[PDB]
């Protein structure tokens, strides 16, 4: 916000005991707003980083077992556990979109995120755990 970011700089530059008092209440609050934000942002970012990675990893595995590969048991297992974690995440993403009501850009990342999430889940469910 380039607006406050200028009203403050003039309250601080002020010379009256009343502008200081305000710049303070402003700072006090801007600092609060910047705390809630970052926290929101990290929650989403971290979540998405996991999803993307877990997506890629499992995707890789599932594919190694497409005609030859994946130690059937010690590889066939990591997957099973990876998968479940993806399933376990659908919930988190959905609540994430639900809470991301102020930034369609992020919201969209969460949705892209979720498609990929569901896509791989419908590939472990398909080829692999589906055929046999």
From Swiss-Prot:
Effect ascribed to mutating residue 27 to A: Abolishes interaction with ARF1, UBC and TSG101
Substitution effect: residue 107 to A: Abolishes interaction with RABEP1, UBC and TSG101
Modifications the protein undergoes after translation, according to the UniProt entry: Phosphorylated by CK2 and dephosphorylated by PP2A. Phosphorylation of GGA1 allows the internal DXXLL motif to bind the VHS domain and to inhibit the recognition of cargo signals. Ubiquitinated.
Documented effect of changing residue 89 to K: Abolishes interaction with RABEP1
Organs and tissues of expression: Ubiquitously expressed.
Residues recorded with modification Phosphoserine: 15
Region annotated Interaction with ARF3, chain positions: 1-104
Sections of the chain in a coiled coil: none
Subcellular localization(s) per the UniProt record: Golgi apparatus, trans-Golgi network membrane; Endosome membrane; Early endosome membrane
Superkingdom of this protein's organism: Eukaryota
Result when mutating residue 24 to A: Abolishes interaction with ARF1 and RABEP1
Effect of residue 12 to A: Abolishes interaction with ARF1, UBC and TSG101
Entry remark concerning the domains of this protein: The VHS domain functions as a recognition module for sorting signals composed of an acidic cluster followed by two leucines (DXXLL motif). The GAT domain is responsible for interaction with ARF-GTP, UBC and RABEP1. Required for recruitment to the TGN it prevents ARF-GTP hydrolysis.
Protein's job: Plays a role in protein sorting and trafficking between the trans-Golgi network (TGN) and endosomes. Mediates the ARF-dependent recruitment of clathrin to the TGN and binds ubiquitinated proteins and membrane cargo molecules with a cytosolic acidic cluster-dileucine (DXXLL) motif. Mediates export of the GPCR receptor ADRA2B to the cell surface. Required for targeting PKD1:PKD2 complex from the trans-Golgi network to the cilium membrane. Regulates retrograde transport of proteins such as phosphorylated form of BACE1 from endosomes to the trans-Golgi network.
Quaternary structure (record): Monomer. Interacts with GGA2 and GGA3. Binds to clathrin and activated ARFs, including ARF1, ARF5 and ARF6. Interacts with RABEP1. Interacts with RABGEF1. Interacts with the type-I membrane proteins LRP3, M6PR/CD-MPR and IGF2R/CI-MPR. Interacts (via N-terminal VHS domain) with SORL1/sorLA and SORT1 (via C-terminal cytosolic domain). Interacts with EPN4. Interacts with CCDC91. Interacts with HEATR5B/p200a. Interacts with SYNRG/gamma-synergin. Interacts (via GAE doamin) with NECAP1 and NECAP2. Interacts (via GAE domain) with AFTPH/aftiphilin. Interacts with TSG101 and UBC. Interacts with RNF11.
Recorded family membership: Belongs to the GGA protein family.
Protein known as: ADP-ribosylation factor-binding protein GGA1
Name of the gene encoding the protein in the UniProt record: GGA1
Positions spanned in the full protein: 171 to 302 of 639
């Amino acid at each position: 916000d380039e607006e406050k970011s200028k009203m403050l700089a003039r309250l601080l530059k002020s010379s009256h005991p009343e502008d200081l008092r305000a710049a303070n209440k402003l700072i006090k609050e801007m600092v609060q707003e910047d705390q809630k934000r970052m926290e929101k942002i990290s929650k989403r970012v971290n979540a998405i980083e996991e999803v993307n990675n877990n997506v890629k990893l499992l995707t890789e595995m599932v594919m190694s077992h497409s005609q030859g590969g994946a130690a059937a048991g010690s590889s066939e297992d990591l997957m099973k556990e990876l998968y479940q974690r993806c399933e376990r995440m659908r919930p988190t993403l959905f609540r994430l979109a639900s809470d991301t009501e102020d930034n369609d850009e992020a919201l969209a990342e969460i949705l892209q995120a979720n498609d990929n999430l569901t896509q791989v889940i419908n590939l472990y469910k398909q080829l692999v755990r589906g055929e046999e």
